[PDB]
Design a protein around this ligand. Structure first.
Ligand code: HEM
Ligand code: HEM
Ligand SMILES: Cc1cc(N)nc2cc(-c3ccc(OCc4ccc(C#N)cc4)c(CN)c3)ccc12
Ligand SMILES: Cc1cc(N)nc2cc(-c3ccc(OCc4ccc(C#N)cc4)c(CN)c3)ccc12
Ligand SMILES: C[C@H](O)[C@H](O)[C@H]1CNc2nc(N)[nH]c(=O)c2N1
Ligand SMILES: C[C@H](O)[C@H](O)[C@H]1CNc2nc(N)[nH]c(=O)c2N1
Ligand SMILES: [Cl-]
Ligand SMILES: [Cl-]
Ligand SMILES: [Gd]
Ligand SMILES: [Zn+2]
Lengths: 404, 403
């Protein structure tokens, strides 16, 4: 049982939940790969073991473990698989499993909210046009005029024989990235490839650096078809600064809803390769990663020029001063627009309280330090001084190969 | 089957073949990663470490498999058979000290690993001689502000005799005093060593920046108290180039970071006293030592004087105050003409170290959580570099406090 110290308070806890982590991570006694973004690489007898496990923790979570319908639900799963090789989740098990998958996500700093999750059951979806209607409903419900609400939409599970539902976009809302003669990119350089695909599947490209991409939605077996997001459904935020009057003239903007649409959801042995989920943004994701990463919009030095900062020498800390003002502008602009957002100080403090809840409720909490600590002001937040244990619990969100 | 490592800023991939030679076992398993923990933790096993280190030394002098190489191997095992231990040649010790620095996964300063002055104090005889050696190390390394990396190696661990130990965790530290209020005056990290110095006869001060005396332990001896001559301890008073009230806080720091409580392991031999020093990266002082809530904890004070709105976290008052403290540190050390490197220049030089080491050895052990600076992490290039953490020998290791 790992001993875990918080160096700011001196307090000690033991992570007993880690002894139950099954699916094995990438580290060995000889070498730690904790910093790798993608670890390593990406007979129904095994299905029964994972299903009986998940049914057991479902009935634990509602007290009713021991006698009664709990004893009953285990047999239906056995009879279901013994008759079909797979099985079906009850609506309530689906809801419980999606909340656990979020609760178990070691890289997510927002898990204090894990019990408030809207789950749309789309397991009877059978069309790409139908997928588009589900996604538009999700977007409308989650955005909610700027008062964002967490939500996931669960499309039908993978089945032996005949293909998967899949969203080819990495998020429901993304900006296009266009190459040109110098190979440099206008727009978002993270999205050049999916942009290239959208064009080669019919899309007419656009103007500049904040064009919302179309959706590439794949029904089983039939190839992907393009869908155009209606502009009144995609809420965006123009970026301005509360005292730097010229900042607005930079023409920056970001979108309201972060909706990851390329991860696979696994529950009780079943795998849902299309299950897009959404919450709301932490400001450093936009202001520090999306706008300031050198391989993203890379705007830092443009802002420093406008601030008249001494870009001639690293030790003026011009990078650091410009980054702070970009995050100030993000927080200001999202508040003015009355769109939900959370700063990295508020977010990390809630994660600490979540660690305390989880210690009492489960005896630990899988956490990935490198992703929990924010990309600016790391040691100014309380999670920097908290040791953390990283491991894999199921239900889970897992990465998966792209559909190409 | 060597780990594949990606840089996300540039898109480049490498393989760390060196990790396959990892000579000890860290704390992670395939069940759970413990990479974020601060402390992760005879004759025949002495001989395998010894042979391995001799092989490394003869490789570096491009003389592997020669008869001098085999002669040294044979002499070592003969000497272990006769005495239970063996003695390093002076050139082996210089090589091994440098390799220990080169192998330190948490050091971002390793581009400099070949420029290390090695002082051989293995003849040291008492605490009084140990003090003289330490004083000359401080004088040499400080060099009136133009700092030079150095290490002083005191006698090895030996069956029959106790260890030489420096009880202080650094050669220069500020006292921490418990108070009436249960608070600490000075540096709260140094409360324990401060209490030990007093109870060994030190008359304390009562300031926030009182330099501590040294407690030096000779084999089988209680530790003995030694005062550093003040003209040896170079300090930098802190000011800010455009916040004139910052000088009135009366903040100071010392020029020389000289870590003194780690064990140096070379070829199975252990040196429990081997203090080493380089020069500061400005965030160690400005963000960790001054702003950590369990250290001097000045961040709120400074933000209030800066007239920031500290009522809400969304004003980012902590990030703004922290940036200006780090500016004060850089400006103050540069004004005093004391060597200092900022976290952007340091992380850029480390990326060049990784490239050099990929060519020389096929990899580089690195602890991402310690290499990435404590502010402005993703503004530096190391943030976007995947890294592989593992233990090579020669090495610097943590060791239990001698009390
Ligand atoms: C409600 C507010 C939320 C906040 C503030 C939040 C915050 C974050 C942040 C900052 C990250 C890492 C940033 C990055 O990957 O670049 C992250 C990752 C993640 N989030 Fe959350 N999140 C929220 C809601 C949710 C919801 C509703 C779900 C799922 C139902 C979720 C599941 C995940 C997962 C699985 C990851 C890791 C994803 C991966 O490894 O690719 N989060 N979150
Ligand atoms: C020359 C300039 C140097 C710089 C800028 C530098 C920088 C750093 C930094 C920023 C750290 C992490 C600090 C922390 O623990 O908070 C570190 C750790 C370390 N450095 Fe270096 N260093 C330098 C020289 C040296 C030398 C000369 C040695 C040994 C010969 C050395 C060995 C180590 C070791 C062993 C650690 C890890 C300490 C630990 O794990 O607790 N460094 N260094
Ligand atoms: C619900 C929710 C809210 C929110 N607010 N955020 C989220 C972020 C993720 C998430 C995971 C991995 C990512 O990315 C992988 C990656 C790793 C390294 C680089 C680099 N260099 C680039 C991308 C990115 C992109 N933020 C997001 C998932 C859900 C989120
Ligand atoms: C040669 C050299 C140059 C330089 N420029 N710097 C160095 C810094 C260290 C070093 C190691 C551990 C530390 O601390 C370990 C620790 C972990 C967690 C907490 C907490 N909370 C506190 C301390 C701290 C503190 N700087 C420094 C060692 C050598 C250095
Ligand atoms: C190389 C490194 O693993 C990579 O930059 C990681 C580090 N930490 C991160 N942390 C968050 N929140 N998001 C990220 O994409 C990353 N990327
Ligand atoms: C809890 C956490 O492991 C601890 O605070 C670490 C994180 N990274 C660090 N990185 C450096 N350079 N120095 C440190 O002391 C620490 N402390
Ligand atoms: Cl994003
Ligand atoms: Cl220090
Ligand atoms: Gd001024
Ligand atoms: Zn690990």
């Amino acid at each position: 049982f790992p001993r875990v110290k918080n160096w700011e308070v001196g307090s000690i806890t033991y992570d007993t939940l880690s002894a139950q982590a099954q699916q094995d991570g990438p580290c060995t006694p000889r070498r730690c790969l904790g910093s790798l973004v993608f670890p390593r690489k990406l007979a129904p007898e095994q299905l029964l073991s994972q299903a009986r496990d998940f049914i057991n923790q479902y009935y634990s979570s509602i007290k009713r473990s021991g006698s009664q319908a709990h004893e009953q639900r285990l047999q239906e799963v056995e009879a279901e698989v013994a008759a079909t090789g797979t099985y079906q989740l009850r609506e309530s098990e689906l809801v419980f499993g999606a909340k656990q998958a979020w609760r178990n996500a070691p890289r997510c700093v927002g898990r204090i909210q894990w019990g408030k999750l809207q789950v749309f059951d789309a397991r009877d979806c059978r069309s790409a046009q139908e997928m588009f209607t589900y996604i538009c409903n999700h977007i409308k419900y989650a955005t909610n005029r700027g008062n964002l609400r967490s939500a996931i939409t669960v499309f039908p599970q993978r089945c032996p024989g005949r293909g998967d539902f899949r969203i080819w976009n990495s998020q429901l809302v993304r900006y296009a990235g266009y190459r040109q003669q110098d190979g440099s990119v206008r727009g978002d350089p993270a999205n050049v490839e999916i942009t290239e695909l959208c064009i080669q599947h019919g899309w007419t490209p656009g103007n500049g650096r904040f064009d919302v991409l179309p959706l590439l939605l794949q029904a089983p077996d039939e190839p992907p078809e393009l869908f155009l997001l209606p502009p009144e459904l995609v809420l965006e935020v123009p970026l301005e600064h509360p005292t730097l009057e010229w900042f607005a003239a930079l023409g920056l903007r970001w979108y309201a809803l972060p909706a990851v649409s390329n991860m696979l959801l696994e529950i009780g042995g079943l795998e849902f390769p299309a299950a897009p989920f959404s919450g709301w943004y932490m400001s450093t994701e936009i202001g520090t990663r999306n706008l300031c990463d050198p391989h993203r919009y890379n705007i830092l030095e443009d802002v420093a020029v406008c601030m008249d900062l001494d870009t001639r020498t690293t030790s003026s800390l011009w990078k650091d001063k410009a980054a702070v003002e970009i995050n100030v502008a993000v927080l200001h602009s999202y508040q003015l627009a009355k769109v939900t957002i959370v700063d990295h100080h508020a977010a990390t403090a809630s994660f600490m309280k979540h660690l305390e809840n989880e210690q009492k409720a489960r005896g630990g909490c899988p956490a990935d330090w490198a992703w929990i600590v924010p990309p600016i002001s790391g040691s100014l937040t309380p999670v920097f001084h908290q040791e953390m244990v990283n491991y894999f619990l199921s239900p889970a969100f897992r990465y998966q190969p792209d559909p190409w």
